[PDB]
Write a protein that binds this ligand. Sequence first.
Ligand SMILES: *[C@@H]1O[C@H](CO)[C@@H](O[C@@H]2O[C@H](CO)[C@@H](O)[C@H](O)[C@H]2NC(C)=O)[C@H](O)[C@H]1NC(C)=O
Length: 597
Amino acid sequence: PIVLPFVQRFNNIDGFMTLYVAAVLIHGALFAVVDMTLNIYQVQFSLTRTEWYLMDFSDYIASFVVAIIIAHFGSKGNRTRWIAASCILMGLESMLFAFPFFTYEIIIPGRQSIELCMEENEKRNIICGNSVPNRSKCIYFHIGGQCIHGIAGMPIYILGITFIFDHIPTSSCGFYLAIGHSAYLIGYLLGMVGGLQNFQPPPKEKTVEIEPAKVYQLLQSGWWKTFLIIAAISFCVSFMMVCFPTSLPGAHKLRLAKRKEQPHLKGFLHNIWHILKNPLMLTQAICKVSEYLTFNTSLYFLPHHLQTQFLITPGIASLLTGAFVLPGGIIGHFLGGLIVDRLEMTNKNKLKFTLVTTVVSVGLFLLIFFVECQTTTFAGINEDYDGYGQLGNLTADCNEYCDCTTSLYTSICGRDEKEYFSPCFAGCKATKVSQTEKTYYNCSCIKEGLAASDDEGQFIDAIAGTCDSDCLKLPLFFAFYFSATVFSNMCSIPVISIILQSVPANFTSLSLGVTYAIVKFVASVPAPLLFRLSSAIACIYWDNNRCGGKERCWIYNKNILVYEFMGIWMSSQLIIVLLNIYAIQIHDVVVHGEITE
Ligand SMILES: *[C@@H]1O[C@H](CO)[C@@H](O[C@@H]2O[C@H](CO)[C@@H](O)[C@H](O)[C@H]2NC(C)=O)[C@H](O)[C@H]1NC(C)=O
């Protein structure tokens, strides 16, 4: 008996939009946390870099095994029911990805595995790896957590937008296409922003080794807190969508406005065959490939590049891309989408709109490449340590006494402006830590250095972290990075907007699945390997003495990576130019075939 005006105003075509972005927002909020959550799980919990990608890969293929199946199933049944169910399986997944943190907080603290580590012995506390059991058990919680993510997450991004296609007019779908994309972006922001404020250490970064044993508690409990709230929201949003009508009263009024004036295998193939037989969609999908190839690569390569040429803390460097690529992205859909929506752009109009959009963007990427040419301050990698030892001498006497470990080595600055790695390897037999900085004392393995130096309560000492005197180029880099990002997000709307037009209304449901199948398999499966091979190409100088099978590098080649990664994007960006010049002529030929004035 719910005949209140609400459920009549809650069956509005925006009443579906209100819950979809509400469904998307927590969906956006979820994944961004997980990538770091997976990443920190690898480093913290005694994993290899081999298994982490496998956990990452689990989300990707899970969407791929449902990007087609649910699309065939979304065509035949109620879209509203399936989305909330896929919203429901978000709730099951998100808490499930938080059970191992609470159940297995005993995996690897510094001293909480009492059976084998003695509280007085230091070598005992870092060996007897009982952490690798109760680790692979969690990975089963985690590979499940990643798989339930993609199997259920993908129908949310297919069916909901399909409901936007088939129920909302064209001249405002891009207005709705943009917000849905951005609601995934805004969760990419806060998935890092909200999550990391708890993962990033408390006001006490700088106490005795209890802090690694206290930071350990706040990350598992940090996500176990976060996912408990996240998952339940995915339930209450699903419960509201289930109450939404099967027969949408909003579309029925519009359907009669647009009415006037089996998914068999062969019929499935009839949809499959025309797509290849229409070289318009052929270009649309591959243009998206270079779009995602250059995008995803940058959002990964950039914090690594800011860590190697601009010498920015890897935790801080990751933030720099995360907190700054979105402001370009959000308006890129917002301004990009509203251009077609306000102007009711035609198929010929958007193709011209896409070309000049990308062409200037590449010259912006090219402009960034020109900026890389400028010289920057160089720390370490000065070939054999001033004649006192070779690369790898690094394991001298002062390494052994303060127990330096070749995996977490960081560069520290001496007063000679020379950059020394492994602040404890600097021979610093004493360290007094203040409230706002970390400093090292009695730094023996330092060279004369120490021209004027300074301090107050103590005299002379070296300051932890890298010292940078010429990082101004940084504002040029982001500035050029922003406008390239904006152009990218206003390339997405033109390609996705066209796909709706050249497909009949009943077949638009299977349209999203066709392109979405290429998203995770053809692109995201071969991509990491293409990066990984060329990642070592600039990371040649691996720590061969300790890490073993390429676990930690020391020379991410600041000249080769710049030429390789951005050149690949230069190779990648231009493919869109060739694809679209192929499309526009073919589009104009085929449109001519239907016009033949
Ligand atoms: C290491 O630094 C400390 C202070 O940061 C220096 O302190 C001296 O330590 C010796 C121990 O042999 C004491 O006899 C002195 O009285 C300490 N000095 C003061 C002012 O308290 C210590 O000298 C440094 N190590 C070396 C090898 O010089």
